Amino acid sequence: RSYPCDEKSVIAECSNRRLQEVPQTVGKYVTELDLSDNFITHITNESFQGLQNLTKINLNHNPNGLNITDGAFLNLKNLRELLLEDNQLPQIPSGLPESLTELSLIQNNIYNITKEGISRLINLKNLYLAWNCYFNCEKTNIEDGVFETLTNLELLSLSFNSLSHVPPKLPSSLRKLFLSNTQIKYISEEDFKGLINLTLLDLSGNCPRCFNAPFPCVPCDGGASINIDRFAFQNLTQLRYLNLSSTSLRKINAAWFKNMPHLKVLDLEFNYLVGEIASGAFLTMLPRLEILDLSFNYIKGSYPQHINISRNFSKLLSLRALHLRGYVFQELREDDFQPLMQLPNLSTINLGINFIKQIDFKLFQNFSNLEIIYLSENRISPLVKFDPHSNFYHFTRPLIKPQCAAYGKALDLSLNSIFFIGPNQFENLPDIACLNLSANSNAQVLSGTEFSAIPHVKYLDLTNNRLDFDNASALTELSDLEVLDLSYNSHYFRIAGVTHHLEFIQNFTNLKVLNLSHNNIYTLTDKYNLESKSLVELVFSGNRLDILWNDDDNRYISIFKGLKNLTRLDLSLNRLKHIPNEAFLNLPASLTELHINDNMLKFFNWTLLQQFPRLELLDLRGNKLLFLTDSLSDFTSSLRTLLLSHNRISHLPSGFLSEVSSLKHLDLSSNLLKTINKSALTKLSMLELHGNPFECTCDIGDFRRWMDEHLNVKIPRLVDVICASPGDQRGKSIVSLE
Amino acid sequence: SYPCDEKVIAECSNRRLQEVPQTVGKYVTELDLSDNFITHITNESFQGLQNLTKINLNHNPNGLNITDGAFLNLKNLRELLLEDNQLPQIPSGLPESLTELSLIQNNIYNITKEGISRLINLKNLYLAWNCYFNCEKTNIEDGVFETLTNLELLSLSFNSLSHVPPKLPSSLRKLFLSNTQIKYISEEDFKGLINLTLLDLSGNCPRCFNAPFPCVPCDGGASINIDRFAFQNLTQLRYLNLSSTSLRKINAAWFKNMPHLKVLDLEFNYLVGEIASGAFLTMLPRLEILDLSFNYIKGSYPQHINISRNFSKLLSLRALHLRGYVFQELREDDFQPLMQLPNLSTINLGINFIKQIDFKLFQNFSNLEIIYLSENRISPLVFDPHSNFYHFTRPLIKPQCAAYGKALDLSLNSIFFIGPNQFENLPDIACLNLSANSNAQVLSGTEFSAIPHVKYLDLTNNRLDFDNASALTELSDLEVLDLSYNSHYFRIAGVTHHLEFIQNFTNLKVLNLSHNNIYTLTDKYNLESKSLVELVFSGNRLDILWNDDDNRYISIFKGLKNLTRLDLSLNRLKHIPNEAFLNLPASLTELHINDNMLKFFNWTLLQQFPRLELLDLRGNKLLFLTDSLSDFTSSLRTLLLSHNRISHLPSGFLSEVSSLKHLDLSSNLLKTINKSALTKLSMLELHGNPFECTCDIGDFRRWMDEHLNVKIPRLVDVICASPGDQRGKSIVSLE
């Protein structure tokens, strides 16, 4: 068995295992070793001795600085990648192997970039020297022609370093150059002259407009802007990506894009370009542009009636996504978005955080191929008759959940002023398949007329509201509806001054997924039971099943009997102390996954599993269960996954593992188990027992011998499996015993 | 006194009592045995207690068994509180001397003559929450209240009655009949009730809302059927509650014989048409409070509010509640009939979702004092049964705010930044609330120029930026400033964080900087003010501030010369540096360093504070106390040290401080109190301590008997930890 690193080209994961030093137990066959988030303090030549097969070594966040001897990695010949991040290193380690192709030195205290450390390494492709001298500083010392010898360099990152000037003598092979928040106020023609192969140029954060940033922001004196020369990007012909975010730009010189025929992505967010959006000459110079970001460009204290979009926006023929966040405007008219209508590839429109009070929705159907319409964090009212390896100015995450957007045209009206669904709310709207009405504080009594204008909605998100759906015809106008998220609608079910009805689910012929999480359901009249012929997944978490199954007339006994096709059921956080035998028998036999975790269950009747021949997964985590059954094979024969973590199980019954043949994954971690008998000890692949108070004496010897015989049964995080008694054996692992 | 605390009223509430204690003194006039595990009540329970006038037995247990004539021996008994006892019927053998009897939250399904008709001296009778959603109808005997000739108040609310009870006494002044399921009201119901000042008919055929009690509306959403001559002889009526009655029209004939009506409740009805055109408004000349809240039409969001011209006839009107009408815009012409009313001081426009208001209309009013526009959509301009269930009795604005003058409430609106015309054409406002607006304005000092006489300003739950030295300085008269829950700015890593504007104020007395997470105050590094007396610096990061490697935030509170109160709670403080504690204001009288992680406290530094009277150090990790506290402090009266790790009290601690009156040592790790450690003390708390009840505890027990004046609260909670046989019982209960 591999200890402490988990073996899986073979990769040995040794991340976060409380290691004070480099382990010698690591096999010679190992090609990739990850020693991240450990308490290692010293790195010597003996640490990686006799390990020629290693190509990648990760030593990030060591400790929680790190001391590296001269030529400690020099013995390694096949070493290509070396990750040395957040180690608090005062300088670049001397004696690095020349065979390296990737080197990262982020979040360190390296204040000097000398030729004695990086110039010797000519085989380097990617070099990362970020967050070194950043608010400590005064200026990052760069040697003259220190990157000139690096002829194979494709990527160079010098971002978040007090540089003040662009480093001279850069290699012509450079494809990606990052210079974000480098305090470089002036950009000249000689800076990017001999860089013909550049596809990306990041000049963001220089003279910035301060916002919600995790890094210290210092704006330029007297509200100064970035001084970029007219011929600065004269020979940048292969450029596809240009990041000019937080540069305090007031005007865009169209001469910058004269030699850019391939530009695909342009970032101009967090600038003062309201005037340039209204009248911009640069827009006619971008014919192959796919992504344009003009977010948070607003004038301070200015709340205009309409958005001023330039007519030249029609020249953006290849445009796919347009991000117009933080412009801050009152109303959006049909004439305002007229130049964008003639674009065939435009599928994404981002109008988030604009505080728009009114939108003439007739304009959206007058578009060629709209797929995503994001109008979240606006003021639409009812219509009546940290990691350094991430983009800090662009949200890389999707605007709409992929599961929603997969159905078709997605409309996001979440975090708006729709306090009730008006009769003209969805009038003159396109054929919407995905609709989000989250956190709108909506208290509408759903009758089944509200969604008649858009009846092809297959995925509907109604989370964080106060909706009423007592009507049998509620949401039924949406016949094609497959996914319904009614999470955090607590207000209705919590109040005793109503009725609580769930008959609307019956009318749906295609509803597959339903989420009723954190609604606080305790009473149901007149329909005590819920039924659906098409439903496969039901999330009934964060409710009150304890009161429901405590009924003195047994009226909610067959509450899940009507769900014939149900395969997945989540009954977690329901405050369940005990489940009645008859109430558990009435559960769907078609079930494959069942989650009864984070409850207060003291007892579980395993005999009732005989009526479920399709059940593969059973979750019973974070409960108050005391014991397990000795004849599990006689009841279940289809169960593959069984989760019983954070329970009060002290003893495993005789012949438990040598009974259920179908079982592959078993969780018994963070319990009250002391010893595992020979009688209790197949197709098992994974077994968790970490955080258990194990008695490491002679009685534990029977279980240790089983671990050696059954190697295939992988036990994760072996270091966390700590002995409780005796005192001398306390702290050490169960496999570490002699 | 054990277990009840004598004050003559003996407080015996929440003490885990399984039975009635016999240790209660004969001199006791009022006994409160509420919230206890008492199950049986007999004639021996209150034996030899003739001096008792009031007996409270509410929530017992947490049902209760009462024998026949258990209270009959008591002659002076006037008030008897028997609530939430799960009693199946009225106890037989009640004393005739009773003037007040309450039987709320019980299971009494029958009101017989054998229980209440004998009691003729009764003034107030409460029979609420008895047969409420269980029993199909509450059984009332014919003329059961007829014998009660001295009855002034009668409550039959929250009981399935269906009809008004017949044969009611003429002496009745207040009659409550809320949620009684009474669909029909006839002339014979309130015929012989000439002395009625209040009539509550609310909750009959109701419009269901956010209610804790089960709401069942009438068949097909039907309205209450009140006869034209139902209130024909109700001449003395001042209060009329007709809330949640599903009313569509108001018959003006109801107010024909009502010249004294002062308060009218018509909330949670369907009276939009009545507000637009109502004949009833001309019949109310002495009306002071009118409530027309949540009268909106379902699915209707009108452009403007339709106010009747007849609203000008309400001459005596003081407060008007127009909540939940649901309208888009408020114009000057819409509030024209109200502008001529001289007594109108309160206008409640809360939860109306108003997008735009012509703020010009408010200066046209005669005497406006409160303008509540909370929970609206204004954007930048460029449970207990003894409470009112349909009216919020609590004030709209905090009294401390409203005391300064004209109060304007714009909390929970869409003001995401303060616009240049935000307060244009506004009256002389002294109290302003801009809470939970998500306001992210970079305050320069021009924002509040239109209303510069604001003395109390509430900016809580926002995202505001105040790094400018001239921020909020346009408000020269400002006395109270609440900047609580404005964490976002100070929380984000690396910006500016300045507080130079405080020194500018010539009369600022109270400042609240709670839950802001201030950790890097650059530069100015310190807080200065020559006028400030109170500062709440709770929920911040003083741990990082006093951990500075250059000691730049050492004199952070040196500038506050007149500061008397300081709250440094929940600041994650592990240790306070000696120099940082020396730089604290000497003028301080109250200091709160509670709910932190303080392991040590230097008591020697208290010598530089000769005015300090209160010192709070609750919920900390402090291990020990000082033995020479008299040598450092001589003005300290109150000292709070609850929920700490103090295991031993030093020798001669209590016999040192002469100014100390209140000392808190509850929920600590103290085992025994020595004779050496054991004056002007009045109160001493030691409850929830692991006391070793053996022979070593004998020295402290003798001190308790000698010093009777030193009152020890909640003696039952002072439980012995060791040994096992003595575990559970109190320290004073030992033999």
Ligand SMILES: *[C@@H]1O[C@H](CO)[C@@H](O[C@@H]2O[C@H](CO)[C@@H](O[C@@H]3O[C@H](CO[C@H]4O[C@H](CO)[C@@H](O)[C@H](O)[C@@H]4O)[C@@H](O)[C@H](O[C@H]4O[C@H](CO)[C@@H](O)[C@H](O)[C@@H]4O)[C@@H]3O)[C@H](O)[C@H]2NC(C)=O)[C@H](O)[C@H]1NC(C)=O
């Ligand atoms: C200015 O604007 C530019 C764009 O114009 C931004 O540039 C991007 O910056 C991000 C962050 O540094 C880069 O993203 C990272 O790329 C790594 C390499 O990607 C390769 O592998 C993927 C595999 O799917 C390929 O698709 C891709 O083509 C590459 O070959 C990833 O490994 C990184 O992932 C990290 O996070 C994930 C979790 O999300 C983890 O699983 C990983 O282990 C890892 O830690 C990451 O995605 C991106 O490549 C840059 N764009 C380009 C085109 O180069 C600048 O960031 C921006 N400046 C500022 C300051 O905002």
Ligand SMILES: *[C@@H]1O[C@H](CO)[C@@H](O[C@@H]2O[C@H](CO)[C@@H](O[C@@H]3O[C@H](CO[C@H]4O[C@H](CO)[C@@H](O)[C@H](O)[C@@H]4O)[C@@H](O)[C@H](O[C@H]4O[C@H](CO)[C@@H](O)[C@H](O)[C@@H]4O)[C@@H]3O)[C@H](O)[C@H]2NC(C)=O)[C@H](O)[C@H]1NC(C)=O
């Ligand atoms: C109300 O309840 C619903 C239903 O439970 C919730 O919606 C589901 O949310 C979960 C996440 O919590 C979603 O599951 C995730 O899907 C990701 C994307 O799916 C890809 O992979 C699958 C693989 O079969 C492909 O079929 C598919 O086409 C996609 O390409 C996965 O990447 C996620 O995996 C990660 O987590 C799992 C553990 O859960 C790990 O095993 C993985 O290694 C990985 O780390 C994950 O499976 C699910 O798709 C959602 N369903 C629907 C219908 O949308 C709502 O979120 C909930 N509402 C609220 C408010 O809580």
Ligand SMILES: *[C@@H]1O[C@H](CO)[C@@H](O[C@@H]2O[C@H](CO)[C@@H](O[C@@H]3O[C@H](CO[C@H]4O[C@H](CO)[C@@H](O)[C@H](O)[C@@H]4O)[C@@H](O)[C@H](O[C@H]4O[C@H](CO)[C@@H](O)[C@H](O)[C@@H]4O)[C@@H]3O)[C@H](O)[C@H]2NC(C)=O)[C@H](O)[C@H]1NC(C)=O
């Ligand atoms: C329909 O509308 C009518 C009004 O038109 C409402 O009637 C009011 O109902 C409330 C609640 O029952 C009454 O308030 C209670 O009054 C009790 C008696 O007050 C006298 O004693 C105090 C002593 O200080 C005097 O100040 C006062 O002037 C009276 O002489 C009090 O005992 C109650 O207080 C108790 O509860 C509160 C918490 O709620 C505690 O803080 C107190 O300490 C105390 O324990 C309470 O104040 C009110 O008096 C009624 N009005 C009139 C004029 O009679 C109906 O409630 C309403 N119906 C519905 C269903 O909403």
Ligand SMILES: *[C@@H]1O[C@H](CO)[C@@H](O[C@@H]2O[C@H](CO)[C@@H](O[C@@H]3O[C@H](CO[C@H]4O[C@H](CO)[C@@H](O)[C@H](O[C@H]5O[C@H](CO)[C@@H](O)[C@H](O)[C@@H]5O)[C@@H]4O)[C@@H](O)[C@H](O)[C@@H]3O)[C@H](O)[C@H]2NC(C)=O)[C@H](O)[C@H]1NC(C)=O
């Ligand atoms: C931010 O911080 C501020 C300041 O700390 C917070 O505002 C204070 O909030 C507290 C409550 O948390 C208020 O204190 C209460 O005041 C009540 C009203 O007091 C008057 O009415 C009493 C009626 O019984 C009356 O006795 C009293 O007079 C007595 O005052 C002194 C009391 O010791 C005494 O010395 C006098 O001689 C006199 O007899 C008052 O006239 C009271 O009923 C409560 O018991 C309690 O004391 C403060 O008044 C508030 N201060 C201000 C300036 O408004 C604020 O809430 C915090 N913000 C947030 C969001 O948490």
Ligand SMILES: *[C@@H]1O[C@H](CO)[C@@H](O[C@@H]2O[C@H](CO)[C@@H](O[C@@H]3O[C@H](CO)[C@@H](O)[C@H](O)[C@@H]3O)[C@H](O)[C@H]2NC(C)=O)[C@H](O)[C@H]1NC(C)=O
């Ligand atoms: C300014 O406006 C805000 C918002 O209207 C006021 O805040 C509100 O204040 C009340 C009273 O302090 C809060 O009520 C409290 O609720 C808790 C929980 O139910 C209860 O335990 C308390 O006894 C009390 O009733 C209310 O929650 C709070 N609302 C919000 C959104 O914060 C504020 O008081 C106003 N300030 C002034 C000076 O008028």
Ligand SMILES: *[C@@H]1O[C@H](CO)[C@@H](O[C@@H]2O[C@H](CO)[C@@H](O)[C@H](O)[C@H]2NC(C)=O)[C@H](O)[C@H]1NC(C)=O
């Ligand atoms: C509907 O909109 C809400 C709000 O924009 C989305 O909720 C956010 O989801 C992300 C990712 O899960 C979280 O990090 C945020 O905290 C959520 N915000 C809030 C306010 O809840 C929701 O995911 C959207 N749903 C769909 C299907 O797109």
Ligand SMILES: COc1ccc(-c2[nH]c3ccc(C4CCNCC4)cc3c2C(C)C)cc1OC
């Ligand atoms: C002085 O002028 C101004 C000052 C502040 C803003 C202001 N206030 C906000 C409040 C909340 C938010 C949130 C919304 C929810 N999501 C997170 C951002 C955003 C803003 C903003 C802007 C950034 C758009 C605007 C201004 O001029 C247009």
Ligand SMILES: COc1ccc(-c2[nH]c3ccc(C4CCNCC4)cc3c2C(C)C)cc1OC
């Ligand atoms: C079908 O028609 C309608 C259905 C629902 C309402 C609706 N929606 C609300 C959302 C939130 C609140 C909150 C605000 C914060 N404070 C607590 C009440 C209130 C409402 C309401 C009303 C009660 C005024 C309005 C309707 O017609 C006008």
Ligand SMILES: *[C@@H]1O[C@H](CO)[C@@H](O)[C@H](O)[C@H]1NC(C)=O
């Ligand atoms: C640690 O660094 C110091 C630098 O002075 C060096 O003397 C020492 O040998 C290094 N290695 C170890 C194992 O301490």
Ligand SMILES: *[C@@H]1O[C@H](CO)[C@@H](O)[C@H](O)[C@H]1NC(C)=O
């Ligand atoms: C590219 O660089 C060369 C040499 O500096 C220069 O002559 C040429 O004008 C540049 N190209 C453009 C298009 O400006």
Ligand SMILES: *[C@@H]1O[C@H](CO)[C@@H](O)[C@H](O)[C@H]1NC(C)=O
């Ligand atoms: C479009 O670009 C051209 C560039 O020469 C400019 O002259 C014109 O004014 C722009 N159009 C608008 C509407 O500003």
Ligand SMILES: *[C@@H]1O[C@H](CO)[C@@H](O)[C@H](O)[C@H]1NC(C)=O
């Ligand atoms: C689309 O745009 C044109 C103007 O270009 C307008 O006349 C028309 O009404 C819009 N809508 C539809 C449905 O054609």
Ligand SMILES: *[C@@H]1O[C@H](CO)[C@@H](O)[C@H](O)[C@H]1NC(C)=O
């Ligand atoms: C239920 O909806 C129907 C139409 O969908 C409507 O006629 C009916 O009034 C609604 N029921 C209630 C009780 O509002």
Ligand SMILES: *[C@@H]1O[C@H](CO)[C@@H](O)[C@H](O)[C@H]1NC(C)=O
């Ligand atoms: C529902 O169950 C029936 C059983 O006959 C099956 O035919 C049908 O395909 C199932 N539907 C879904 C959506 O799983």
Ligand SMILES: *[C@@H]1O[C@H](CO)[C@@H](O)[C@H](O)[C@H]1NC(C)=O
């Ligand atoms: C399990 O349930 C059955 C009834 O279905 C019952 O006979 C049996 O005793 C139960 N077992 C336990 C351990 O509760």
Ligand SMILES: *[C@@H]1O[C@H](CO)[C@@H](O)[C@H](O)[C@H]1NC(C)=O
């Ligand atoms: C109530 O107390 C009397 C005492 O005489 C007893 O006879 C009766 O059974 C008690 N009732 C209950 C339910 O214990």
